[PDB]
Amino acid sequence: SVRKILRMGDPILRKISEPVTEDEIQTKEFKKLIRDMFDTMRHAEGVGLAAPQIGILKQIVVVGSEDNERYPGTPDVPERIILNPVITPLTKDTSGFWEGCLSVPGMRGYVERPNQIRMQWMDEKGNQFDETIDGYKAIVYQHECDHLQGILYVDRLKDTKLFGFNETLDS
Amino acid sequence: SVRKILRMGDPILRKISEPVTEDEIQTKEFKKLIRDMFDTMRHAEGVGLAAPQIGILKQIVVVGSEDNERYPGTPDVPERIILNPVITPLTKDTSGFWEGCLSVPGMRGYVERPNQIRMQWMDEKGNQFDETIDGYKAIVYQHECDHLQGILYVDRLKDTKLFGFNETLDS
Ligand SMILES: [Zn+2]
Ligand SMILES: [Zn+2]
């Protein structure tokens, strides 16, 4: 079901989320949470969503694009669940991008993150992964994994001069 | 009359405003602009307003409190016009405060500025001043004079962790 997304200024968004246990991924609740998250992410036309954005300090991330309106250009991102992620940059090369966040409504900010990272996670069935991601996917996983450590993209603005409300950015 | 206040993201808010000439302060227009500004500032329940906030790169600032709702606590600030201001800090002592801006709707950010400055300006009649201001007044004049150099308070956030939407800050 759709859930209330917390906005910037709420102290939760700044706390550290803790790991999900192997047991936990069987609980009826869990499966229902992942459900709500996806329902929520979709209703918001969002590209990804982290558990703490809805008030749950659990290392649970969900992504999924498909013709996303909010970030029109961006290539499609296949629905997937990311649990207990751990990212590591593999380069200093950085791709720029006007990031946005559902917890930071109606605004965009240019942010440069490394364009090639090594992420390690676990999924709903409990499978371990350790791949090297790059491109938009990398950009998305990083933005979303940051939430898990209490970090919002406004913390990484390249410059505060390149930050503002959507409406005016172009108009 | 009330005028449209530009929001953050509009390039004007980042440009430098130029000095007002002694002649200029007689023009019918000028007097009408100061009029609009005051009308605008009041309608917005704002404490101060800089010309560029309404799209005029002229060094014109206007302030005026009296039981302001937006920043409830704040002491009263007598209506006054500040032209071609030039501020200089007189101390490193800084008073903290959760600043807000009409060009940055519905948000607050903790900002520490020097609590005792020396400001020099000219008024509508063309009189030169050179006083030492302190307290809330100092805080207000600095915030507003910054606009004259293309600077918004989000550029001076003490920490991005202490920045967010009003609604949530307390709720
Ligand atoms: Zn976000
Ligand atoms: Zn302002």
Side-chain angles (χ1 to χ4, degrees), chain A residues 1-21 23-26 28-30 33-34 36-38 40-64 66-68 70-75 77-166 168-169 171, chain B residues 1-21 23-26 28-30 33-34 36-38 40-64 66-68 70-75 77-166 168-169 171:
Chain A
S1 60
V2 159
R3 297 231 213 178
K4 171 190 166 190
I5 303 184
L6 314 182
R7 304 199 303 292
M8 181 177 57
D10 189 312
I12 299 294
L13 299 175
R14 298 291 173 179
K15 296 161 164 300
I16 292 185
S17 314
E18 52 173 44
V20 176
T21 67
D23 310 46
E24 193 149 38
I25 72 171
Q26 268 85 58
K28 297 303 85 172
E29 303 85 295
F30 181 76
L33 168 58
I34 307 298
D36 282 31
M37 290 185 70
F38 267 99
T40 299
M41 176 177 95
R42 289 178 198 147
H43 171 276
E45 184 72 41
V47 183
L49 186 70
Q53 293 190 63
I54 50 177
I56 298 170
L57 294 162
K58 274 295 178 184
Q59 306 190 193
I60 304 174
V61 169
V62 160
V63 305
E66 192 164 63
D67 298 334
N68 173 60
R70 294 186 66 234
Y71 310 86
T74 75
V77 168
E79 288 174 295
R80 201 166 318 214
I81 286 70
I82 314 297
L83 296 178
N84 303 160
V86 166
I87 306 174
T88 298
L90 298 173
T91 186
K92 302 300 284 182
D93 276 47
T94 54
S95 295
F97 191 90
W98 281 84
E99 277 180 49
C101 175
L102 295 173
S103 293
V104 179
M107 295 172 86
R108 292 305 157 76
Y110 184 80
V111 183
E112 311 183 308
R113 303 173 185 270
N115 46 50
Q116 192 173 65
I117 52 85
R118 171 202 163 199
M119 180 170 92
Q120 303 165 58
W121 67 110
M122 179 178 90
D123 61 30
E124 353 73 65
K125 254 85 79 296
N127 301 302
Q128 310 303 297
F129 292 78
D130 181 315
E131 302 310 304
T132 48
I133 326 308
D134 68 4
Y136 189 53
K137 279 227 289 176
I139 300 304
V140 183
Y141 293 160
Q142 300 187 73
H143 173 105
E144 248 62 48
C145 288
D146 269 347
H147 280 301
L148 302 187
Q149 308 202 69
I151 303 175
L152 304 191
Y153 80 95
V154 302
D155 296 5
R156 297 181 190 292
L157 294 177
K158 183 192 181 180
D159 186 312
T160 31
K161 294 175 179 62
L162 311 170
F163 173 41
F165 301 76
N166 303 164
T168 90
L169 285 174
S171 294
Chain B
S1 60
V2 159
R3 297 231 213 178
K4 171 190 166 190
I5 303 184
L6 314 182
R7 304 199 303 292
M8 181 177 57
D10 189 312
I12 299 294
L13 299 175
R14 298 291 173 179
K15 296 161 164 300
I16 292 185
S17 314
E18 52 173 44
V20 176
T21 67
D23 310 46
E24 193 149 38
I25 72 171
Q26 268 85 58
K28 297 303 85 172
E29 303 85 295
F30 181 76
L33 168 58
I34 307 298
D36 282 31
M37 290 185 70
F38 267 99
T40 299
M41 176 177 95
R42 289 178 198 147
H43 171 276
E45 184 72 41
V47 183
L49 186 70
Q53 293 190 63
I54 50 177
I56 298 170
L57 294 162
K58 274 295 178 184
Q59 306 190 193
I60 304 174
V61 169
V62 160
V63 305
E66 192 164 63
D67 298 334
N68 173 60
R70 294 186 66 234
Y71 310 86
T74 75
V77 168
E79 288 174 295
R80 201 166 318 214
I81 286 70
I82 314 297
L83 296 178
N84 303 160
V86 166
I87 306 174
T88 298
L90 298 173
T91 186
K92 302 300 284 182
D93 276 47
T94 54
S95 295
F97 191 90
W98 281 84
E99 277 180 49
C101 175
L102 295 173
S103 293
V104 179
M107 295 172 86
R108 292 305 157 76
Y110 184 80
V111 183
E112 311 183 308
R113 303 173 185 270
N115 46 50
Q116 192 173 65
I117 52 85
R118 171 202 163 199
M119 180 170 92
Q120 303 165 58
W121 67 110
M122 179 178 90
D123 61 30
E124 353 73 65
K125 254 85 79 296
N127 301 302
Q128 310 303 297
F129 292 78
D130 181 315
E131 302 310 304
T132 48
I133 326 308
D134 68 4
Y136 189 53
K137 279 227 289 176
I139 300 304
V140 183
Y141 293 160
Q142 300 187 73
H143 173 105
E144 248 62 48
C145 288
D146 269 347
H147 280 301
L148 302 187
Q149 308 202 69
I151 303 175
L152 304 191
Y153 80 95
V154 302
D155 296 5
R156 297 181 190 292
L157 294 177
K158 183 192 181 180
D159 186 312
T160 31
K161 294 175 179 62
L162 311 170
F163 173 41
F165 301 76
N166 303 164
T168 90
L169 285 174
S171 294

